[PDB]
Design a protein around this motif. Structure first.
Motif, mmCIF file in Angstrom:
data_model
loop_
_atom_site.group_PDB
_atom_site.id
_atom_site.type_symbol
_atom_site.label_atom_id
_atom_site.label_comp_id
_atom_site.label_asym_id
_atom_site.label_seq_id
_atom_site.Cartn_x
_atom_site.Cartn_y
_atom_site.Cartn_z
ATOM 1 N N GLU A 295 -2.901 -3.563 -7.953
ATOM 2 C CA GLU A 295 -4.046 -3.357 -6.957
ATOM 3 C C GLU A 295 -4.847 -4.791 -7.082
ATOM 4 N N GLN B 66 -2.860 -7.771 -5.256
ATOM 5 C CA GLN B 66 -3.417 -7.600 -3.925
ATOM 6 C C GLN B 66 -4.600 -8.356 -3.520
ATOM 7 N N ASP C 133 0.866 -1.287 -0.095
ATOM 8 C CA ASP C 133 0.078 0.104 -0.090
ATOM 9 C C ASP C 133 0.915 1.232 -0.122
#
Lengths: 139, 12, 134, 139, 12, 12
Positions: free
Chosen positions: A76, A79, A61
């Motif tokens: 993203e 993740q 992040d």
């Protein structure tokens, strides 16, 4: 299969690298001690895997910002892929708990191993993406 | 990470 | 090497330097009514820059944090010295001392720009340490 | 790995053998189709494999009464295993739905395939247990 | 079948 | 920074 992490990046200041390592080790630990382990033992082994993954995700992040906006999407996605891999490991774990005392304890334990292995492999794919990203940023 | 913590809270 | 496409720090430093530049090329013929707003812009550009740098610090190695905080202090200082000369300049408008005051103004503004460039350099080096350059 | 179903048993009236075949088949219908199709098309393609398993489970429920008492446990366990295999498949579906027109949509589909192949290998194992069960009761 | 219907109901 | 250097250069 992917190649060993690129050698064109210094890893002494790489916390992503360090946390991927920490996560893969927690997975290796759990899968080496799991066969004979009871619920008291392997539930915390998975906890540790989760902690490792949370740390990893937090660190990612705090990295995205230094990376090209054009790469934020693939990262993203990588993740979210890990969060689900953990999700599947916890599912199988709970099943293992439920079926302690039964023939299925060992079957679901194999499934936890599979789950955990997917999570490790995906953590390394994340690292390879973030590394691809750092190189674009370094031009 | 809030959904991840719903999970992290599941192992207590 | 670094991609500046979305480097807000690099974008603000550029803006601060451009502000220091428009103020400088325009100062001599200008009245105080025209150069006070000019210094006010330099200040808005500096405030904007420090805000950005303030949000970037958390993403950089703690080992670099103080060198950055010093560079940050230095800049507020230069605005301080620049604002000072600007006031002297206003006071002595129409006097034999008006020129030496705008000249010190240019010196303060130029120093500000040099010091913003060095901050950009310190911060770039901290990004290189994070991004992991060889 | 198990050897081909035993020849020493008549399959003319074996609804378990039929229902397993049905389930395996409904899985293969999704396994060879789905890649293309969007959520307006696999959500039911799953509902199918889910209905075909409901049936198989239903039949095993009518068949257990008859077999030796001792053997009802491995068979009940084999059934619970199939339940969780379907749970895996559904979790992978619910996900591929939440991630349509993404790099993730293709992923959770490879996982749907995985989860469904599991359901099939197990359905065949269920069958294998029960055959050992019938053979026992015969000797 | 009650746990299987929890499943069959998930698909709506 | 080559464009920012055109600037840095404007002040000498």
């Amino acid at each position: 299969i992917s190649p060993p992490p690129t050698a064109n990046l210094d890893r002494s200041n790489d916390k992503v690298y360090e946390n991927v390592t920490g996560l893969v080790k927690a997975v290796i630990e759990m899968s080496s001690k799991i066969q004979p382990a009871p619920p008291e033992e392997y539930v915390p082994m998975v906890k540790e895997v989760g902690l490792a993954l949370r740390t990893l995700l937090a660190t990612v992040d705090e990295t995205i910002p230094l990376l090209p906006a054009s790469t934020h999407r693939e990262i993203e996605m990588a993740q979210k892929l890990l969060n689900s891999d953990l999700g599947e490991l916890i599912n199988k774990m709970k099943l293992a708990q439920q079926y302690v005392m039964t023939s299925l304890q060992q079957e679901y334990k194999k499934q936890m191993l599979t789950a955990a292995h997917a999570l490790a492999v995906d953590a390394k794919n994340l690292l390879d993406v973030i590394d691809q990203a750092r190189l674009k940023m370094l031009g | 990470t809030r959904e991840l913590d719903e999970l992290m809270a599941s192992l207590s």
